[PDB]
Structure formats: C-alpha cells, structure tokens
Amino acid sequence: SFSQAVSGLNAAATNLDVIGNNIANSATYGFKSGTASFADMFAGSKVGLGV
Amino acid sequence: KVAGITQDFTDGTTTNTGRGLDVAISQNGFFRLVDSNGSVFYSRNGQFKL
Incomplete structure (x- = not known):
C-alpha cells in the first residue's frame, strides 16, 4: 500500500545521510566511519508491514 | 421492515x-x-498525548 512505500522512502534517506556524512568527514584525523542496518517489521498477519 | 444495524469487528490493517x-x-x-x-x-x- 502507501505505507510500505513511504517507509521504504523514509529508510532510504538515512542510508544516504550517513554516506554523505562519511564523504564529508573523509579528511579529518580521528574519525571512524558509520553505517546503518535495516530490519523488516511484521504485525500478527502474514503480509508485511514495511522496513 | 429494517431489522437493525450491526457493526463489524474485523481486525483492520496495522499501519x-x-x-x-x-x-x-x-x-x-x-x-x-x-x-x-x-x-x-x-x-x-490509540493516539495518546500528555
């Protein structure tokens, strides 16, 4: 439906923000890079819910 | 003759x-x-606020 698509759009935005952050901070001296990890959601039924 | 109006308590979609x-x-x-x-x-x- 609309909810799964808008959750996918919302979760593919932090996955670009944390890459833009690394691209920006790839010149400093004490930095440790970061990443994100996703996981699916489920209600009581068998159809999915989003991400 | 219309008998009576009844609800439907089927579970909805979780969003x-x-x-x-x-x-x-x-x-x-x-x-x-x-x-x-x-x-x-x-x-x-289930919308709650302080």
Missing part, C-alpha cells in the same frame, strides 16, 4: 506511523478510559 505514543492491539481487546465525571468507556483508537 506504521513512526511517532512515539501510539499503540495498536493485534487481537481482541479494548483500552479502558475514564471521564472527569466518573463513567468508564472502552476505546480502540
């Missing part, structure tokens, strides 16, 4: 919202609520 204070029962049940006068009501809408 993801994202905010903090929101709950959703996944099987049968209701939340219990009290007015400022003293009667008790039973609800299923």
